[PDB]
């Protein structure tokens, strides 16, 4: 199927590898991306554990909240990394790494 990745609003930062692959974006995760990933996951796990005490299900609510937070944090980190690679976010380190490549 025909696809187009061009955006209506042009990128305001240098663009490297305009259409990155999933594996390449995942391999571009920085320390900040892991920090926000872990923060979202931990917040979700804590909320699930605290909310499930009254019904009597701590473990099940913990796992449900953990799944929700895992998915949300992973997609947030992927969004940030893809934007950095594609030039929509400040890619201070991406251009430094890929200029020497």
């Amino acid at each position: 199927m025909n696809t187009d990745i061009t955006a209506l609003e042009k990128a305001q930062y240098p663009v490297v590898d305009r259409n990155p692959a999933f594996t390449k974006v995942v391999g571009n995760f920085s320390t900040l991306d892991y920090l926000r990933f872990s923060t979202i996951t931990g917040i979700s796990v804590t909320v699930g554990y605290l909310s499930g005490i009254k019904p009597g299900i701590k473990g099940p609510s913990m796992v449900t909240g953990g799944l929700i937070g895992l998915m949300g944090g992973f997609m947030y980190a992927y969004q940030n990394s893809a934007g950095r690679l594609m030039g929509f976010f400040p890619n201070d380190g991406e251009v430094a790494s890929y200029q020497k490549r």
């Binding site: 320390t31 900040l32 923060t39 931990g42």
Partner: peptide, 30 residues
């Protein structure tokens, strides 16, 4: 009696500590 027995509650404590540390790092690293 120097052992916390509830495994589920221990994981919640670890997750809360991780969330706090990650939030602090997020506010510092960015």
């Amino acid at each position: 009696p120097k052992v916390s027995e509830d495994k589920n509650r221990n994981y919640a404590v670890v997750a809360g500590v991780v969330a706090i540390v990650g939030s602090i790092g997020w506010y510092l690293k960015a």
